[PDB]
Amino acid sequence: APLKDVYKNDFLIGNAISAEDLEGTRLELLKMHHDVVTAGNAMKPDALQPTKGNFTFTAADAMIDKVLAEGMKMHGHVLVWHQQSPAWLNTKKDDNNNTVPLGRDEALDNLRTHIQTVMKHFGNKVISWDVVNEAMNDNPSNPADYKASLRQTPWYQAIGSDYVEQAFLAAREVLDENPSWNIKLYYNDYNEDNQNKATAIYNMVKDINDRYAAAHNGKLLIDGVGMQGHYNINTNPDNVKLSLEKFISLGVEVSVSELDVTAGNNYTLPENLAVGQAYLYAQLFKLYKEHADHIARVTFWGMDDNTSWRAENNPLLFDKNLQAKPAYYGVID
Ligand SMILES: CO[C@H]1[C@H](O)[C@@H](O)[C@@H](O[C@H]2[C@H](O[C@@H]3CO[C@@H](O[C@@H]4CO[C@H](O)[C@H](O)[C@H]4O)[C@H](O)[C@H]3O)OC[C@@H](O)[C@@H]2O)O[C@@H]1C(=O)O
Ligand SMILES: [Cl-]
Ligand SMILES: [Cl-]
Ligand SMILES: [Cl-]
Ligand SMILES: [Mg+2]
């Protein structure tokens, strides 16, 4: 059954692509099963503004035009991150040639110009953007203080603990100026089943959205939280459920943005763990169907195990020959 038909009334079904997925049998498989795609790499900061003022949209524009011509939607990923992001945005070389943070004013100017120029370039060719990715430390010991729980990344070091909020405000201004665009703004992160990290992300989004809503008649600044769903055979779906509930209580939409389930290593998937992997996918989709009114999209991070970013750990619904694994039957249910 095509995945997007099974879940047609529940959430968009997504995948995560490179230029390889837009031709041949892979394109057919992609179109048959998914309503939406995320660029695995082509819309990251390193790909779109590799040096200051040098915006490079040609490959990303070809990808998005082909995705749309082929009947699918595009989720935009990602405007602000501490990986795949050029050092010029938030650092410089001191005299003694050490890498040090830029000052707040200059980093804020780079942050805003990146977000605004990229969003204005694509316009409403995307349905959503991951504005800020992975800003939270793992297993934070004091999630009551979100700011102290933030990863001290290059953006934090140049701008300060308010940079996640400044990123969203810059994105929100573009949508205020282009009111006909329908684009949801998301904050995206992983290990969101760790109850400490989920509390810290909840506290961040709550503080930022409460202050915005008080000033703007109840409007959301952060529209969405992306649970990346980089899960493993020991992931406890009860902790997923607690986290999904917590985020829903913000009044945001949720997406499961980069779903995969590592099982095995060294490219070897034992038969009993193919069955364990299928069983956990089936438990997760049972959970997602139960919360479908608050879940906009569930995206798998890749098509098949040999082309996963974690290929060694056999994470996905199809094998290297594009043949359905037990996982696939677990999802279709
Ligand atoms: C051991 O070094 C390895 C890198 O650290 C590892 O990430 C990988 O780098 C590649 C790059 O691969 C993409 C990495 O991003 C993946 O997607 C991200 C997953 O992390 C978050 O959850 C993000 O939100 C999500 O965007 C992509 O799926 C991977 O394709 O691809 C460009 C390549 O030039 C880098 O080297 O591999 C490194 C390695 O040495 O193997
Ligand atoms: Cl092919
Ligand atoms: Cl073509
Ligand atoms: Cl408009
Ligand atoms: Mg890509």
Q: Is 41 in the pocket of ligand 1 (CB under 6 A)?
A: yes
Buried b or exposed e, range 52-82, using 16+ CB within 10 angstroms = eeeeebeebeebbebbeeeebbbbbbbbbbe
User: Hey, how many other C-beta atoms are within 10 angstroms of the C-beta on 270?
Assistant: 12
Closest CA to 219 of 281, 168, 158: 168
- Starting from the CA of residue 18, give the closest ligand: 5
CA distance 125 to 183: 9
Give me the DSSP letters along 17-65.
E-GGGGSHHHHHHHHHH-SEEEESSTTSHHHH-SBTTB---HHHHHHHH
User: Hey, how many other C-beta atoms are within 10 angstroms of the C-beta on 47?
Assistant: 17
Q: Is 165 in the pocket of ligand 1 (CB under 6 A)?
A: no
Domains of the chain: 1-333 (3.20.20.80)
Contact 10, 288 (CB under 8 A): yes
Q: How far is CA 99 from CA 45, 149, 155, 272, 325, in A?
A: 19, 24, 13, 49, 47
Closest CA to 300 of 49, 24, 94, 16: 16
End-to-end CA distance of the chain: 10
Q: How far is CA 259 from CA 210, 238, 289, in A?
A: 29, 16, 15
Tally of CA atoms within 13 A in the half-sphere of 299 that contains its CB: 27
Q: What's the gap in Å between 42 CA and the centre of ligand 5?
A: 4
CA distance 17 to 167: 25
Contact 200, 146 (CB under 8 A): yes
Contact 67, 31 (CB under 8 A): no
Q: How far is CA 60 from CA 9, 215, 307, in A?
A: 30, 36, 20
Q: Is 40 in the pocket of ligand 1 (CB under 6 A)?
A: yes
Contact 304, 311 (CB under 8 A): no
Q: Which two tokens stand for residue 146?
A: 């979100």
Q: Method of determination? A: X-ray
Q: What's the gap in Å between 277 CA and the centre of ligand 2?
A: 27
Q: Is 133 in the pocket of ligand 1 (CB under 6 A)?
A: yes
Q: What's the gap in Å between 309 CA and the centre of ligand 1?
A: 6
Q: What's the gap in Å between 184 CA and the centre of ligand 4?
A: 15
- Starting from the CA of residue 74, give the closest ligand: 5
Pairing relationship of beta strands 73-80 and 224-227 according to DSSP bridges: unpaired
Mutate to test the pocket of ligand 1, among 309, 310, 313, 316 (most ligand atoms within 8 A of CB): 309
CA distance 288 to 13: 12
* Residue 267 dihedral angles phi and psi, to the nearest 5°: 60, 20
Which one-letter amino acid corresponds to residue 64? Answer: I
Catalytic residues: 134, 189, 258
Give me the DSSP letters along 243-304.
HHHHHHTTT-EEEEEEEEEE--BTTB--HHHHHHHHHHHHHHHHHHHHTGGGEEEEEES-SB
For ligand 1, atom 32: residue with the closest CA: 41
CA distance 76 to 171: 12
Buried b or exposed e, range 230-269, using 16+ CB within 10 angstroms = bbeeebebeebbebbebbbebebbbbbbbbbbbbbeeeeb
